[PDB]
């Protein structure tokens, strides 16, 4: 309930094949607001669509206007849909996007992945 101001946030879009999670933080990685496709009330096949990601980003941005945050940098991560609709929702929330960076983690050899589904 106590107030704290903060400018120049960073928005992380975490997009998978099933969901998307948008989290706005400060420079130090302290989360202020977050939202998700499932939290928006989609819950299923509708959860894996750019519309759900756009709504999630809208909610997260509206929550984040409380602290100020005139500026956001963007970190996209993941192969799923909602990858770009989240960003174009975030700007329409009113922020000033300085840059976009892709931070998808790629192993160089890494652990072996699961076996292939026989569908």
């Amino acid at each position: 309930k106590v107030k704290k101001t903060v400018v120049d946030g960073i928005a992380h879009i975490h997009a998978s094949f099933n969901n998307t999670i948008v989290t706005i933080t400060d420079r130090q990685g302290n989360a202020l607001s977050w939202a998700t496709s499932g939290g928006s009330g989609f819950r299923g096949s509708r959860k894996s669509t750019p519309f759900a990601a756009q709504v999630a980003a809208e909610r997260a941005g509206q929550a984040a206007l409380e602290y100020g945050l005139k500026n956001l940098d963007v970190n996209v991560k993941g192969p799923g849909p909602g990858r770009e609709s989240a960003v174009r929702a975030l700007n329409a929330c009113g922020y000033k996007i300085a840059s976009i960076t892709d931070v998808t983690p790629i192993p160089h050899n890494g652990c072996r992945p699961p076996k292939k589904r026989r569908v």
Partner: protein, 152 residues
């Protein structure tokens, strides 16, 4: 059809109001080729409309028609395990046809004395958004906007 060769016909002859839309409405209320009976029913309903109050009956007619044509329609499509329901905008010609079909069908089942009275009651009630047809339109609209995810 596959060939896309259907050509639309031109038979539209409103006798004494000279209104293009009322002829199609009478075609919709017609049953089994009896043009005269439907003619009489529609004119009686419009007389009731003009004598309840000061509104021009024809103007009340297109005001109800505007207040009842849906804007978007839900189309079913099976995607391989579940049948989803996409929204799509309704063509301008389909709006009026859907409006008349709904209006007539819901006036069929009201329960007053004569069919003309049923139609008059439906026009009066739907002219401001209180009939069964208007709430069906609202049901279709909410069903369409609850599936906005697919849309495209």
């Amino acid at each position: 059809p596959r060939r896309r060769v259907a050509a639309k016909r031109e038979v539209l002859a409103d006798p004494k109001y000279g209104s293009q839309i009322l002829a199609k409405f009478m075609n919709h209320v017609m049953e089994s080729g009896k043009k005269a009976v439907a003619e009489r029913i529609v004119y009686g309903a419009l007389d009731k409309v003009k004598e309840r109050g000061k509104a021009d009956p024809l103007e009340t007619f297109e005001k109800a028609l505007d207040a009842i044509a849906p804007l978007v329609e839900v189309k079913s499509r099976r995607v391989g395990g579940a049948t989803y329901q996409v929204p799509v905008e309704v063509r301008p010609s389909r709006r009026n046809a859907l409006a008349m079909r709904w209006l007539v069908d819901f006036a069929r089942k009201r329960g007053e004395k004569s069919m003309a009275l049923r139609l008059a009651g439906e026009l009066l009630d739907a002219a401001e958004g209180k009939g069964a047809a208007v709430k069906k339109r609202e049901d279709v609209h909410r069903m369409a906007e609850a599936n906005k995810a697919f849309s495209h």
